[PDB]
Amino acid sequence: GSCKGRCFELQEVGPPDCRCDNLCKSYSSCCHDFDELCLKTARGWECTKDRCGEVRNEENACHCSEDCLSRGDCCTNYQVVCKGESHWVDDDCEEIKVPECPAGFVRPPLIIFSVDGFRASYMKKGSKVMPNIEKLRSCGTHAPYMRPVYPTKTFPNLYTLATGLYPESHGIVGNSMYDPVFDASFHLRGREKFNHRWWGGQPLWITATKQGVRAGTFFWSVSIPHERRILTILQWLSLPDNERPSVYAFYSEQPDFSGHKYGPFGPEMTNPLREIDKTVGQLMDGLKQLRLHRCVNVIFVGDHGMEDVTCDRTEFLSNYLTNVDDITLVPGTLGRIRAKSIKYDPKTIIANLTCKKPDQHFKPYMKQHLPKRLHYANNRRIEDIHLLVDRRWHVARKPLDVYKKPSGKCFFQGDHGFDNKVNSMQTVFVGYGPTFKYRTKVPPFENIELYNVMCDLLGLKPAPNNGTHGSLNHLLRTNTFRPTMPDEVSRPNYPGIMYLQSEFDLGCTCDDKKGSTKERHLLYGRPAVLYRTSYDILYHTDFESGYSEIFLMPLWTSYTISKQAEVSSIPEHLTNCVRPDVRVSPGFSQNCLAYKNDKQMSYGFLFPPYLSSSPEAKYDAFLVTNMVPMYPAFKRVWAYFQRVLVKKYASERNGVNVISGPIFDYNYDGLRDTEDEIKQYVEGSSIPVPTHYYSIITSCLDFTQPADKCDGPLSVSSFILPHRPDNDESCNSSEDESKWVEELMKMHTARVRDIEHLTGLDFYRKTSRSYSEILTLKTYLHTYE
Ligand SMILES: *[C@@H]1O[C@H](CO)[C@@H](O[C@@H]2O[C@H](CO)[C@@H](O[C@@H]3O[C@H](CO)[C@@H](O)[C@H](O)[C@H]3NC(C)=O)[C@H](O)[C@H]2NC(C)=O)[C@H](O)[C@H]1NC(C)=O
Ligand SMILES: CC(C)CCC[C@@H](C)[C@H]1CC[C@H]2[C@@H]3[C@H](O)C=C4C[C@@H](O)CC[C@]4(C)[C@H]3CC[C@]12C
Ligand SMILES: [Ca+2]
Ligand code: NA
Ligand code: NA
Ligand code: NA
Ligand SMILES: [Zn+2]
C-alpha cells in the first residue's frame, strides 16, 4: 500500500488499491506517500558544481552522485557540470545514418513530444529563443507547418495524431460533445472522458501493445512537473529489455496556456517557448547522458496553432435567433447547435443565421454541406447544424456568456478551433532521429498522416486510418512501407458507331438535324474505376470521358487547355442543343424530356463548349454523354468556372489539365455512394443527382514547361463543389460571378484523395513520377492562404 519502489510504475494496478503511476492523481488514487516518494523536489532539477560526487541523498529530486548513472536517475545536466561534457544543443549536428542504440534495444525508441497550441510561426523566433528545438528542426526532418484536423481543438487533434483518423471516425469530434446514444456529454474537464465508450479507432499505444510493442503510459497528471516527466521517461529508458517501453509521450500544456492568455504574437510568449525548449534541452541532455541521443526517434509535434482572439470579437446567436434559450450551442471558435429539448426547426434556424449581418463573421451549415475537406459530418456526435466561425472571432449564445473583469477586458487574447486551412491554426512537426532524414525540408502535410509514420517508426501495422500510407515516405531515410497502385476493378468499354441516330427517342433537339487525343487530354493516364461498374471510354477532339452506363453520365471528363487557348461563345443555334451519342445505347443515355419535366433541375456539360478548339469540334461538347444534371443556381458557379476560370488557370500555370465529374455522397460519409444510397434523381427518370462536382486541375510545377510537355513534378489544385439548388452559402452571390465564385471554390478546395474516396477513381496512374511522389501529390491541399 505504498509507492516505495513502484514510483511511476507501468503496471496495471487499478481499483480499489492505491496506484503510483502517471495518472494516479487524475483517477484520485495515489498512495499516501506518492508525493513524498515519487514527486521529490529537493535541490531542484539541475546539478551544481558543489553537488558533483555528492553522498547520495534519497530526498533529492535528482542525483549528482557518482552512482546515479547506474541508477539512471541523474539530473539531466549531470555530465555537463560534473564530467565536463557539453550540452546536446552546443554540439555540431552529425548525421545519424543508422541507430546507435545500446545493446538489447530491439527497435529505435520513439519519443512523441506533444506541445499544445504550438503555432507553426513560433519556429521563426528560434535559435536563441529555442536553441534545442531549432537544432532538432534544422538537423532533423521538418515541415514548414503541419495541418491539424477540424476542429483545431486539443482532444480531436491529439487523438487524430494517435489514430490517424478524422474526428468523425475516431469519435472525439470536439473537446466537448454530446452523444445521443449514450445520453451523456464528453468534456476535457471531468471523469467522463476516462470512459472508454467515447474513443473509437485504435490509438498508437493500443496498436503497439496489440503487436507486442511496449508503450509507456502517454498521459501525465498536471500535478507532475515537466522535469519529473522527462526524468521518468529517462528512468523508463533505463529499464531492462523486457520492461522498457519502445514508444513514449511527453505532453506540454504550453505554449497553449500562455497563447490563450496573451495571444500568439505577444512578447510574453518567449518565456514559455524558452521554458519548453529548456524541457527539450533536458530531454536531449538526458538522452545524450544515457547514450540515446543518436538512438531515439524524437517527434516534436503540435496539436494546433493559435489565433488572435479577444472577447471583443464575438458573434451572438441572440442577435440572429428568436429564442436562443431553446438552443444548446457549443460556443467559441466553432459552432454546434442542438435542440435543447427544453418549437425547434433546423431549417428555420439555418435560414435566419444565413447572411443576415453585412459582415457576418460566421457561416451556418448543415453538416453535410460543410466543405468536404473538413470530413466533419459522419458522426452522431456532430450536430446537424454547424457554424464556421471566421478566424480571429468567436460565436456565443447571448452577450452575457462573455466575461471581462475590468473595462474593455478580455481574460484571453488568443484561441483556436477554426477551419484547419487557416494559417494561424497550422502547427509544427519536427522529426529527429536515425529513421528520419537529415537536414531535410518536407512539404506541409496533414496530421492524419502521422499515425502511419509512427507505426512505420515502430515497425507496426497501422490500423485502418485516413492517412495515405506512403505519402510521407519522403520524411524517412528508411521506408518499411512500399505503396502499390490499387488494381483497376472495372475495365472500360470502347464502343464504336453501334446505334443509328434514328433509334433515339430521347426528346433531344439540336440545330444540326483514339490515343491521338489520349496524348493531349489524358496526360496522366485514364483514371482507374476501383468498383464494379459498366462504363465506356468516349474519345473526342477536345476531351475524353469515362461514361458510366449505370449513372448515365461520365464518371470523369479529362481535357487539356493550353496557355494560348481561346474561349469562344456558345453559338446561338446550339444554346439548347443536346445531340445523341451514337456510341451509347438509348437505354443508357439520359432523356432530355426528363430535364423538361424536372422544373427544378437543368443540365450542364463536364467539358465546356466554351473551350472547344473549332466550331466543328464544339458539337461533341453537346453530346448527351457530356451532360450532367445541374441546378440553375449551380450552373452559375459551373459556367463561370468553365468559361473564365479554366482559361485563367491555363494562362497562369502554362496550360492545365482538367478532370471533372460528379460526386454522389448522400450519407455524407466521404465515400462514393452505391446505387441504393442515391436519394435524388431527375424527376421521372433514373438519372441520379450528384451531391458534388469535382475538378482536378493539374499543370507543371516548373511553370516554364507547358502542362502537356512537363518532365518533372506536377502542381495540382482540386475542389469538390457542393451541388446545391441555391447559392445561400455565398452571401455575395447576388453580384457578378467574379465576386463570389472563386471565393466559394477556394473554400471547397480539396485533395485529390478526397475526390478518390468520393468517386472510387484512382488518378495519376501513368506519370514519370514515383508512386510515393504521386501519393504526396494526391494528399496536397491548395489552401489559398
Ligand atoms: C477514414 O478511415 C475509416 C477507417 O478506415 C473509414 O471508416 C471505415 O469505413 C468502412 C467502410 O465504410 C467500415 O468497414 C467495414 O465495411 C464492411 C462493409 O462490407 C462491413 O462488413 C464491416 O462491418 C465494416 N467495419 C467494421 C467491421 O466495423 C469501417 O467500419 C469504418 N471504420 C471506422 C474506424 O470508422 C472511413 O471511411 C475513412 N474516411 C474516408 C473519407 O475515407
Ligand atoms: C487529464 C489528463 C492529464 C489525462 C487524460 C487521460 C485520458 C485522456 C486517457 C487515459 C487512458 C486513456 C484510454 C486508454 O489508454 C485506452 C483506450 C483504449 C483504446 O482502444 C481507445 C482509447 C482509450 C479508451 C484511451 C482514451 C484516452 C484515455 C481515457
Ligand atoms: Ca457515401
Ligand atoms: Na489512333
Ligand atoms: Na428544368
Ligand atoms: Na446567396
Ligand atoms: Zn490543444
Residue numbers in the entry: 56 to 397, 401 to 571, 588 to 859
Can you list sentences taken from the study reporting this PDB entry?
In this work, autotaxin from rat (r-ATX), which is a phospho­diesterase producing the lipid-signalling molecule lysophosphatidic acid (LPA), has been used as a challenging case study. ATX is the main producer of LPA, forming the ATX–LPA signalling axis with LPA acting as a multifunctional lipid mediator by engagement with six dedicated G-protein-coupled receptors (LPA1–6). ATX regulates many pathophysiological processes [e.g. vascular development, neuropathy pain, fibrosis, rheumatoid arthritis, sclerosis and cancer]. The X-ray structure of r-ATX (MW 100 kDa) has already been determined through conventional cryo-MX, giving a good control over crystallization, with minimal optimization to obtain sitting drops containing micro-crystals. r-ATX was expressed using a stable HEK293T cell line and 800 ml of cell culture yielded purified protein with a final concentration of ∼4 mg ml−1, which is inadequate for batch crystallization.
In addition, we determined the r-ATX structure using cryo-SSX by collecting 10° wedges on many micro-crystals via the Mesh&Collect strategy. This served as a reference structure that was used for comparison with the iSX model. Interestingly, on visual inspection of Bragg reflections from the iSX dataset in 3D reciprocal volume, the data appeared to be complete up to 3 Å. Similar to the cryo-SSX dataset, preferred orientation was not observed [Figs. S3(a)–S3(b)] in the iSX dataset, even though microcrystals were plate shaped.
